[PDB]
Design a protein around this ligand. Structure first.
Ligand SMILES: *[C@@H]1O[C@H](CO)[C@@H](O[C@@H]2O[C@H](CO)[C@@H](O[C@@H]3O[C@H](CO[C@H]4O[C@H](CO[C@H]5O[C@H](CO)[C@@H](O)[C@H](O)[C@@H]5O[C@H]5O[C@H](CO)[C@@H](O)[C@H](O)[C@@H]5O)[C@@H](O)[C@H](O[C@H]5O[C@H](CO)[C@@H](O)[C@H](O)[C@@H]5O)[C@@H]4O)[C@@H](O)[C@H](O[C@H]4O[C@H](CO)[C@@H](O)[C@H](O[C@H]5O[C@H](CO)[C@@H](O)[C@H](O)[C@@H]5O)[C@@H]4O)[C@@H]3O)[C@H](O)[C@H]2NC(C)=O)[C@H](O)[C@H]1NC(C)=O
Ligand SMILES: *[C@@H]1O[C@H](CO)[C@@H](O[C@@H]2O[C@H](CO)[C@@H](O)[C@H](O)[C@H]2NC(C)=O)[C@H](O)[C@H]1NC(C)=O
Ligand SMILES: *[C@@H]1O[C@H](CO)[C@@H](O[C@@H]2O[C@H](CO)[C@@H](O)[C@H](O)[C@H]2NC(C)=O)[C@H](O)[C@H]1NC(C)=O
Ligand SMILES: *[C@H]1O[C@H](CO)[C@@H](O[C@H]2O[C@H](CO)[C@@H](O)[C@H](O)[C@H]2NC(C)=O)[C@H](O)[C@H]1NC(C)=O
Ligand SMILES: *[C@@H]1O[C@H](CO)[C@@H](O)[C@H](O)[C@H]1NC(C)=O
Ligand SMILES: *[C@@H]1O[C@H](CO)[C@@H](O)[C@H](O)[C@H]1NC(C)=O
Ligand SMILES: *[C@@H]1O[C@H](CO)[C@@H](O)[C@H](O)[C@H]1NC(C)=O
Ligand SMILES: *[C@H]1O[C@H](CO)[C@@H](O)[C@H](O)[C@H]1NC(C)=O
Ligand SMILES: *[C@H]1O[C@H](CO)[C@@H](O)[C@H](O)[C@H]1NC(C)=O
Lengths: 211, 613, 220
């Protein structure tokens, strides 16, 4: 079976640079390769067919080159709506087959998260469970650590977090962390703190509430 | 002069529309006609229709029928001869029958005052109640004495009084009124000496053996008309033949003085728009099995090598107007087609059937019908194919897709989503225009080994061979170009599948060596081809068995030898010069030499001491 | 304008079958095949099969025994059926059409159908506000939102002030809780002391269960 190996898993580039994506087929394959762009929540979009053949409607800063095993999708001056996953496909062996994708990410200056902590709403409690929410707004890069201290015992296996895809305008990220505890677990402790570590915060920031 | 020739007719007693219509076509056929190749049939002609064009008719090959006419005169005044190569009924070469109608009127005057020979056959006269004079005619002069016994002469005039024969007439015999209608006797009136016809009553006015109606002199070229053939007004037993055994060349050779045969005539070239058969006779057009072509401003029939060229509309046009594919209904109309003018589409509908166009499922077996196809003018489109069939077997003889029309203006060959393993297109040596697309054939191998650019004629043609079984996989399973193929590619696994051989080839098949020095049919080579030695060379043990094609290029003759040629037998009874048949015997060394001129039937040795009696 | 549009119930019980219709416009199925490709987080974009123009199909080996694609040319409609789904089979299913006859360079795609394979029941979300913590001053930056919790299956939509509030809005990817229900947050950055706008309403819609819910967000 034909393997298609895309790389890197995440490509990180400054906006305006010439960026190039690579797809390696495990058997030499002529020019029987196509490329797609897929934007969050979108269906894929054809960019190049047969390795180098432009598709109409696609902006000219997209090119492709390659023949045999080694193919390359390229972008001169990367824009901010070039933020997507890029896929290769092969055309030579039954069945057609896709690569796993490269994610294109725009580099940007470090932007510290604005941190916010939210006690569980009215009612939710008296309806059984409490959800506690930390929010880190508009940061870059994506690497962020969030630890929950409850009276200062570090917490584990009681939180889930979620990160937005990269914003096309400010090109940043937004995380949110949710502490889940049934009523009376909340209503046993007092202090509920949220502790963020991130490149753009000289020492960790902490946000708490309720004493 | 060069006699005008008409076809003749064989409608017998049938009547082509109105009396009016009938006569018009009678006139159309015979107007101006001198020699009738077929029969003369004069039929259903009514009172007061001018039949005078018949005065031109000199000769009839077939029979003469005159029946159901009420016309008064039938002026066949120059008819000299009826050969009777065919008979009307039973064995009459002349039949004059019921020339009358209900209205108490019929035929009066049949003045055939120049009818001297009926070459074969008898004569019937019956129910001509208005006929005159003919009853006095003395047939023993006209009819051969073998046919007298089947003669049927019943003369009964009940509708008029007739004119009388001139006293000038012999034995009161005449064709009608006047000295000019007296019988001219040319047989029964001649001395013992003469074999056949005459023009006087003396020994020195016999006609040459060769004449039919009579003559103007002694010699073979004074005939009125010829018993057998005529060759520029010389009467002969046969037309001089096209080939004579050449004593010098030791075989058949174009007879320079030779001639084609046309009717009762020997001729150097056939009349306009006639073809010469492989026997030297002028015919109107070629027998199936054979075809028209030309050497020296002469159209001839040669026999077809494989199936005869036959052209058929593609799907879309003609019988196949409004058809989506070759299918159970239409496929029969493809039998024997050799060239398709248009496109072939073989589509899934063909195999499911289609209740909408009332077509049953196609029996895939029936695709064998396409095997005769060598040429597609447009495009070949195959979107379905029986799954248990390894390649495109029905197109193994396809030589060229011209791609004049193309699918969607693009493809001249499209093969899509089949179960095949090889293309099988081993005869395809040209795709004139259009693009190839071979897609989604998950078991398909071999396709890449071909250099498609060599089949192409136009430099912009593209190939798209996509999503088939991979190069990798095929190679990994041995499904790869046979060893005996050159680096020029495959249409499949087999040695007859290669574009070209690395060594040599028999027919379509690739091989490592010819059968020089060992083998069934011993062979020689030329342009990497193994060509068989003529079957009359002996297989040799030590060296080669021949140097070329002829019976001249044997090392050693398997049987007998005739000049430089090895033959199976010595020439025995072949036609030669001066119409002297030719006979040879084989001596001690099994070498042919001429027999004594005198051995009418061949010989076993030299001289009269070689053909005992 | 080539267009493909999918309809089909996307939540599917295990061993039950998935059916999707693909209505097609701007070309005919007479001339073009329609392919089917699915996508998941884990095992990538994967080709499933084709109904080619002439009506014959072809299925990738792993779905040979359980794929069924049909069509009705005159209504330009394609009909994907797959039997006996398991959780392997959760994905976004797509129809596609190649740019070019008989090829696989897929220039055109339906909007995809989000197909979820679980035996669980459908449930509407409950909605709690994440009220803004009282600061004192500033002018520019204060955060607040909504917790959209305990619903199944995906998706849910969130608009603010009935769509009349765009920038600042971050609606996080849902997260599958240990209860098997999904949960979410939809957050917005705001001018502190709510300068300009007072009303912050939360417009949560869950189509699978058909539950519209609105919550208001202030310090109650
Ligand atoms: C497998 O292979 C086999 C073998 O190749 C294939 O078999 C062929 O298949 C063809 C496709 O089916 C088929 O051709 C079809 O023939 C149809 C019927 O033909 C006859 O009728 C003709 C017209 O009838 C009426 O209409 C005329 C005008 O409207 C009128 O002039 C007639 O007098 C008659 O009058 C009546 O009309 C009205 C109601 O009918 C009414 O208003 C009026 O008062 C009258 O009552 C007729 O013209 C025709 O004659 C032709 O051929 C003969 C010789 O055979 C020749 O002498 C004549 O000169 C003449 O050329 C015949 O008698 C016909 O209806 C089909 O087609 C349509 O043409 C256009 C374009 O394609 C189409 O848009 C029209 O209509 C509807 O048709 C579709 C359904 O078919 C609908 O979906 C559309 O909505 C559309 O509007 C026309 O009808 C077509 O021509 C052929 O005969 C088959 N051949 C053989 C050998 O069997 C097979 O198909 C293959 N299968 C597969 C899967 O591959
Ligand atoms: C294809 O050719 C064959 C002969 O080569 C035709 O079949 C013959 O038809 C004649 C009458 O025309 C018969 O006397 C023979 O017995 C037939 N031979 C067979 C059936 O083997 C045949 O008609 C041709 N096909 C078409 C439809 O043109
Ligand atoms: C489709 O074609 C394939 C490939 O030729 C057929 O499968 C092969 O069948 C032979 C026996 O006839 C086996 O020995 C091979 O092993 C098969 N190849 C494999 C492993 O795929 C297949 O039968 C054809 N399809 C149908 C339905 O006839
Ligand atoms: C070869 O041609 C000659 C033509 O001259 C034929 O004629 C010869 O024999 C006849 C005997 O019946 C005579 O009638 C001719 O006078 C005589 N001609 C000559 C040569 O003077 C001859 O028959 C032909 N040969 C054969 C085999 O018949
Ligand atoms: C292909 O299948 C047919 C139909 O069942 C069968 O008769 C035939 O033997 C098979 N293979 C061939 C043509 O050799
Ligand atoms: C072809 O056969 C010859 C015999 O002369 C042999 O020597 C040569 O190596 C062969 N090459 C092939 C496989 O075509
Ligand atoms: C074959 O036979 C001839 C005899 O005529 C001889 O001269 C020659 O040497 C032989 N050829 C070969 C190739 O051995
Ligand atoms: C033959 O007679 C016809 C009557 O059909 C007459 O029209 C024609 O001129 C004659 N043919 C010639 C060219 O003499
Ligand atoms: C998915 O699960 C089923 C049922 O246990 C199994 O048969 C199948 O092979 C699995 N396939 C995958 C990993 O997609």
């Amino acid at each position: 079976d034909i393997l298609l190996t895309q790389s890197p898993v995440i490509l990180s580039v400054s906006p305006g640079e010439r960026v190039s994506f690579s797809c390696r087929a495990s058997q030499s394959i002529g020019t029987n390769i196509h490329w797609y762009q897929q934007r969050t929540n979108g269906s894929p979009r054809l960019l190049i067919k047969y390795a180098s053949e432009s598709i109409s409607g696609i902006p000219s800063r997209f090119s492709g080159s390659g023949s045999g095993t080694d193919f390359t999708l390229s972008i001169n001056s990367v824009e901010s709506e070039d933020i997507a996953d890029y896929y290769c496909q092969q055309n030579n062996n039954w069945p057609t087959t896709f690569g796993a994708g490269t994610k294109l990410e725009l580099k940007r200056t470090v932007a510290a998260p604005s941190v916010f902590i939210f006690p569980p709403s009215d009612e939710q409690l008296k309806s059984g469970t409490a959800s506690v929410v930390c929010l880190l707004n508009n940061f870059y890069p994506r690497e962020a650590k969030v630890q929950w201290k409850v009276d200062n015992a570090l917490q584990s296996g009681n939180s889930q977090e979620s990160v937005t895809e990269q914003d096309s305008k400010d090109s940043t990220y937004s995380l949110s962390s949710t502490l889940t505890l049934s009523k009376a677990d909340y209503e046993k402790h007092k202090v509920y703190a949220c502790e963020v570590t991130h490149q753009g915060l000289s020492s960790p920031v902490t946000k708490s509430f309720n004493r | 002069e060069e006699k005008k020739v008409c076809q003749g007719t064989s409608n017998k007693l049938t009547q082509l529309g109105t009396f009016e219509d009938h006569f018009l076509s009678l006139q159309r056929m015979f107007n101006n006609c001198e020699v009738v190749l077929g029969n003369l049939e004069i039929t259903y002609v009514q009172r007061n229709y001018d039949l005078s064009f018949l005065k031109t008719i000199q000769e009839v090959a077939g029979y003469v029928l005159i029946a159901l006419n009420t016309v008064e005169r039938i002026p066949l005044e120059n008819l000299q001869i009826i050969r009777g190569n065919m008979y009307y009924e039973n064995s009459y070469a002349l039949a004059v029958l019921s020339n009358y109608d209900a209205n108490k009127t019929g035929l009066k005057e049949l003045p055939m005052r120049n009818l001297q020979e009926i070459l074969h056959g008898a004569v019937r006269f019956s129910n001509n109640p208005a006929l005159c004079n003919v009853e006095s005619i003395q047939w023993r002069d006209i009819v051969s004495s073998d046919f007298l016994s089947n003669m049927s002469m019943d003369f009964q005039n009940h509708l008029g009084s007739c004119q009388k024969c001139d006293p000038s007439c012999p034995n009161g015999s005449c064709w009608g009124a006047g000295e000019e209608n007296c019988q001219k006797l040319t047989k029964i009136i001649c001395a013992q000496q003469c074999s056949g016809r005459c023009r006087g009553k003396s020994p020195s006015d016999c006609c040459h053996n060769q004449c039919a109606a009579g003559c103007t002199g002694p010699r073979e070229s004074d005939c009125l008309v010829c018993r057998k053939f005529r060759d520029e007004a010389t009467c002969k037993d046969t037309c001089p033949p096209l080939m004579l055994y050449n004593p010098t060349t030791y075989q058949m050779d174009v007879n320079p003085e030779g001639k084609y045969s046309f009717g009762a005539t020997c001729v150097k070239k056939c009349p306009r728009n006639y073809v010469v058969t492989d026997h030297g006779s002028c015919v109107r057009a070629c027998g199936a099995d054979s075809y028209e072509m030309e050497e020296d401003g002469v159209r001839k029939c040669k026999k077809c090598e494989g199936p005869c060229r036959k052209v058929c509309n593609g799907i879309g046009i003609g019988e196949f107007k409004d058809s989506l594919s070759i299918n159970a209904t239409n496929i029969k109309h493809f039998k024997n087609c050799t060239s398709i003018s248009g496109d072939l589409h073989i589509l899934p509908v063909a195999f499911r059937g289609d209740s909408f166009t009332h077509t049953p499922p196609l029996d895939p077996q029936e695709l064998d019908i396409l095997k005769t196809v060598k040429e597609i003018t447009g495009f070949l489109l195959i979107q379905a194919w029986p799954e248990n069939r390894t390649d495109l077997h029905a197109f193994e003889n396809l030589e060229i897709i011209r791609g004049r029309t193309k699918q969607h203006g693009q493809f001249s060959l499209a093969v899509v989503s089949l179960n095949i393993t090889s293309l099988g297109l081993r005869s395809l040596k040209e795709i004139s225009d259009g693009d190839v697309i071979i897609s989604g054939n998950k078991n398909l191998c071999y396709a890449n080994t071909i250099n498609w650019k060599k089949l192409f004629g136009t430099s912009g043609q593209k190939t798209k061979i996509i999503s088939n079984r991979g190069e990798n996989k095929c190679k990994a399973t041995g499904q790869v170009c046979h060893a005996l193929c050159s680096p020029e590619g495959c249409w499949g696994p087999e040695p007859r599948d290669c574009v070209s051989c690395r060594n040599v080839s028999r027919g379509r098949e690739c091989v490592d060596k010819c059968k020089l020095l060992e083998g069934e049919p011993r062979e020689f080579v030329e342009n990497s081809e193994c060509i068989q030695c003529h079957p009359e060379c002996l297989p040799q043990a030590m060296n080669i068995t021949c140097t070329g094609r002829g019976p001249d290029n044997c090392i050693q003759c398997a049987h007998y030898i005739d000049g430089p040629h090895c033959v199976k037998t010595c020439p025995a009874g072949v036609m030669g010069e001066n119409n002297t048949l030719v006979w040879k015997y084989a001596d001690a060394g099994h070498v042919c030499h001429l027999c004594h001129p005198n051995c009418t039937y061949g010989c076993t040795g030299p001289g009269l001491r070689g053909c005992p009696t | 304008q080539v267009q493909l549009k999918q309809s089909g119930p996307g939540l599917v019980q295990p061993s039950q079958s998935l059916s999707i219709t693909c209505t097609v416009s701007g070309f005919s199925l007479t001339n073009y095949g329609v392919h089917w490709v699915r996508q998941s987080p884990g095992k990538g974009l994967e080709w499933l099969g084709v109904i080619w123009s002439g009506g014959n199909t072809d299925y990738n080996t792993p779905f040979t025994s359980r794929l069924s694609i049909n069509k009705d040319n005159s209504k330009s409609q394609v009909f994907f059926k797959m039997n006996s789904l398991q959780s392997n089979d959760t994905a976004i299913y797509y129809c596609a059409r190649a740019l070019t006859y008989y090829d696989y360079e897929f220039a055109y795609w339906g909007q995809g159908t989000l197909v979820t394979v679980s035996a669980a029941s459908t449930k509407g979300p409950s909605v709690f506000p994440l009220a803004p913590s009282s600061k004192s001053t500033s002018g520019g930056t204060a955060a607040l939102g909504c917790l959209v919790k305990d619903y199944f299956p995906e998706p849910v939509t969130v608009s603010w002030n009935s769509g009349a509030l765009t920038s600042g809005v971050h609606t996080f990817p849902a997260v599958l809780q240990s209860s098997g229900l999904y949960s979410l947050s939809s957050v917005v950055t705001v001018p502190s002391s709510s300068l300009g706008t007072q009303t912050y309403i939360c417009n949560v819609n869950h189509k699978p269960s058909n539950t519209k819910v609105d919550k208001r967000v202030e310090p109650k």
